[PDB]
Design a protein around this ligand. Structure first.
Ligand code: GFJ
Length: 777
């Protein structure tokens, strides 16, 4: 029971009142499932458990200091040496140990591969680790255990809330209609309106595909009012026969992609009531039955269905787009080949997950092609897979079981699945499904729940704190609310709630002691908070800041930074390190989330605000933080990151860049904050005091500049190869309801910036056109 109450606070809704056997089915089925995984988990070998709880954070001569669970010993080792070898030094049997990063949830392949080690090499800090014996790891593991060929007709009985009242009714597969829409008669505005009018569609009932959905639009004429959709099949495959009442969603005219569950605010939802003509008790045929069984271009793809399977396995997608889905034989045949289809590359499955592949068998097929996804790939695509959950038609689906499975097998997966689900629980459409999934996951780690509660309580006191700061600053100076802010933070409950947590931005980072002294807040607008931490165990890698925002929408920034991080991975996985900074960014709730602070950096504007001439400002700041020899690295740091963000900002169409939202690190790395727009919703950007830095300050030094210009072009064509990768993810993201990612024209921005129609060298001469266009500043 306490566990039940804990799950209810964490996920934000109470745990029944719907007595819906679909919902009851989901919960007990998935709970058995999730408890199975948590059982398996407790029986893993101790290196298998590290892999679960602390997945290694790789990327695609050396001083290092080691202790055991207070005396440390410093060594030198080879950047090429294996953690084993390090341990063996430390011992003077190594296989009985792992290396923990001090004060992080990280354990340690040549050390040149470990994120924490390069985050130390590139930054001169000296790695500090701890030998943790395998007995002691087992302790954690243990501590964390618990036949009918008439036309389909419905009937539109009547309605309930408020010229002339039309209803439009369409039948769709995906966002394709299996026939013609039917409208109603123009009954008069006011009501509670009556229709009692049979609507009959040009489809045989034996020809509704398993995933068919009836879609209504209620509007007003001499203006739209409400929309609503449902499956003609229940979640047990039973064609549904009867009277259903349809609590409608408000509008924008049909909306086949929107949810198949009704508007839950039954107090003000227009209801549309309707009759489903019974027809005999008909369940959609089993799989085994089914297996027994320009337009000229479509016809010659249906055509050699077989040659496509034989010789073009990955063209699956566009054979599924030519398939006549209203014809049940056209579907048995296609669906018959698909049970023999060779598995597909991840890229191709990322296209199949989309909504214009509604059929649940293809969805299964797509999932099956996704079990080979590495955990690092899953993590990169994870946001899209979450948003695709909104397209599903039932609660129990391969997609949900696949995530839960992966979530429960990698704790960093589970961590982020949780926050993605939790962050939308305020959205009517999805609250039930996301709530239900967070619940099954919680019965998979009763331990991780308690860690997440901990994060939630901090996120909760940050909300209160910001609210007091918004109120307090209305009446008071910036410095007077600041010291009030600290007094509130100093209270009892705030110190306890805000301290000793895993960072929701990155669970491997630990937020221990909140440094009240160094907290502050932006005194403009939504009063975003600056919260700083320290940890004596982690040393300097314990000094970490997080920015809290309450008021702003962070979904867009998060997507943009995932994309830049994807870019940097693509680039690093072709040899090219543009030295990017994809900092953490995570919506946690309604207009609420977190930003990872990048320490030791500032804004162009703050740097320009002051040298004799403004162009000297950046270079002199760089000269100041990188003495003598060291400037030279900064200039290359600066130059690569410049090119990388020039390419990134251009592709993603991020305008509105100015000297307050472009930042620079003391290493010389330049990076962008505050995204919020993108897709133009832009020209190549470039600014002579950047040019100035790239040229070592010398008036014009075309031997530096041109190679900088070669960086940009290399990045641009690297990314241009993976343009489909970018197109497919964004396609899935249209499910997010992001306002700048609304329609088709948004995705057609990306198509252009990525010259995706043209050749590799014709796009690069066109890229060359923009780059000089932009240079004249
Ligand atoms: C207003 C604002 N937005 C941001 C963003 C950002 N991102 N999306 C959307 N807005 C990112 C970073 C940021 C992020 C990472 N590293 C560093 N250094 C940053 F400045 C800082 C941001 N700021 C801030 C600038 C100055 N002072 C701030 C403060 F006192 C408290 C909180 C603030 F947010 C501050």
């Amino acid at each position: 029971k306490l566990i039940n109450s804990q799950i209810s606070l964490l996920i934000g809704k109470g745990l029944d009142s719907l007595r819906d056997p679909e919902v009851n089915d989901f919960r007990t089925k998935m709970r058995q499932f999730c408890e199975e995984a948590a059982a398996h988990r407790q029986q893993l070998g101790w290196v298998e458990w590290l892999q679960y709880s602390f997945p290694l954070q790789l990327e695609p001569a050396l001083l290092v200091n080691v202790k055991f669970e207070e005396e440390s010993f410093t060594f030198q080792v080879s950047t090429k040496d294996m953690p084993l070898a390090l341990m063996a030094c430390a011992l003077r049997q190594p296989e009985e140990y792992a290396l923990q990063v001090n004060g992080r949830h990280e354990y340690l392949y040549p050390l040149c591969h470990f994120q924490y080690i390069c985050s130390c090499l590139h930054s001169g800090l000296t790695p500090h680790l701890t030998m943790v014996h395998s007995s002691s790891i087992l302790a954690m593991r243990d501590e964390q255990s618990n036949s009918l060929e008439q036309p389909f007709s419905i009937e539109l009985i009547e309605g309930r809330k408020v010229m002339k009242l039309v209803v439009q009714a369409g039948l769709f597969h995906g966002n394709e209609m299996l026939c013609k829409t039917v409208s109603s008669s123009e009954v008069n505005v006011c009501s509670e309106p009556v229709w009692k009018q049979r609507l009959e569609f040009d489809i045989s009932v034996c020809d509704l595909p398993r995933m068919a959905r009836l879609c209504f639009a209620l509007y007003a004429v001499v203006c739209p009012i409400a929309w609503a959709n449902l499956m003609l099949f229940d979640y047990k495959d039973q064609l549904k026969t009867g009277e259903r009442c349809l609590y409608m969603w408000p509008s924008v005219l049909l909306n086949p992609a929107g949810t198949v569950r009704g508007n839950p605010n039954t107090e003000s939802a227009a209801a549309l009531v309707i009759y489903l003509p019974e027809v005999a008790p008909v369940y959609f045929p089993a799989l085994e039955k089914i297996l027994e069984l320009y337009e000229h271009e479509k016809d010659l793809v249906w055509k050699m269905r077989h040659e496509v399977q034989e010789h073009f396995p990955e063209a699956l997608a566009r054979l599924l787009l030519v398939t006549k889905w209203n014809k049940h034989e056209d579907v048995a045949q296609m669906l018959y080949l698909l049970c023999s289809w060779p598995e597909l590359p991840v890229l191709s499955a990322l296209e199949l997950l989309d909504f214009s592949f509604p059929d649940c068998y293809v969805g299964s097929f797509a999932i099956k092609s996704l079990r080979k996804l590495t955990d690092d790939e899953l993590f990169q695509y994870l946001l899209q897979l979450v948003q695709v959950l909104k397209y599903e038609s039932y609660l129990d689906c391969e997609l949900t079981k696949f995530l839960l499975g992966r979530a429960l097998a990698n704790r960093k997966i589970g961590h982020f699945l949780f926050w993605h689900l939790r962050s939308e629980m305020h959205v009517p459409s999805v609250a039930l499904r996301f709530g239900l999934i967070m619940e099954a996951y919680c019965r998979g780690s009763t331990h991780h729940m308690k860690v997440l509660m901990k994060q939630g309580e901090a996120l909760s006191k940050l909300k209160a704190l910001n609210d007091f700061v918004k109120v307090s600053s209305q009446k008071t100076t910036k410095p007077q609310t600041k010291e009030m802010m600290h007094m509130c933070m100093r209270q009892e409950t705030y110190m306890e709630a805000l301290s000793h947590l895993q960072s929701p931005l990155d669970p491997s980072t630990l937020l221990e002691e909140v440094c009240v002294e160094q907290c502050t807040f932006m005194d403009s607008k939504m009063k975003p908070l600056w919260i700083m931490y320290s940890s004596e165990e982690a040393g300097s890698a314990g000094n970490v800041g997080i920015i809290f925002k309450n008021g702003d929408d962070l979904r867009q920034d998060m997507l943009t930074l995932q994309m830049i991080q994807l870019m940097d991975v693509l680039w690093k996985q072709e040899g090219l390190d543009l030295r990017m900074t994809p900092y953490g960014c995570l919506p946690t709730g309604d207009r609420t989330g977190l930003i990872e602070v990048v320490l030791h950096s500032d804004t162009i504007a703050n740097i320009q605000l002051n040298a004799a001439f403004n162009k000297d400002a950046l270079l002199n700041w760089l000269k100041s933080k990188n003495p003598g020899e060291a400037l030279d690295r900064a200039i290359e740091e600066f130059t690569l990151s410049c090119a990388g963000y020039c390419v990134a900002t251009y592709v993603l169409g991020i305008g509105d860049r100015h000297s307050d939202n472009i930042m620079i690190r003391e290493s010389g790395q330049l990076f962008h904050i505050d995204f919020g727009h993108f897709l133009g919703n832009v020209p190549f950007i470039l600014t002579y005091d950047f040019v100035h830095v790239i040229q070592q300050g010398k008036t014009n030094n075309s031997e530096k500049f041109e190679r900088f210009r070669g960086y940009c072009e290399r990045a641009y064509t690297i990314l241009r190869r993976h343009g489909l990768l970018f197109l497919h993810l964004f396609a899935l993201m249209r499910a997010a309801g992001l306002p700048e990612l609304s329609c088709s024209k948004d995705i057609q921005y990306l198509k252009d910036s990525l010259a995706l129609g043209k050749t590799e060298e014709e796009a690069l001469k066109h890229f060359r056109v923009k780059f000089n266009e932009a240079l004249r500043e």
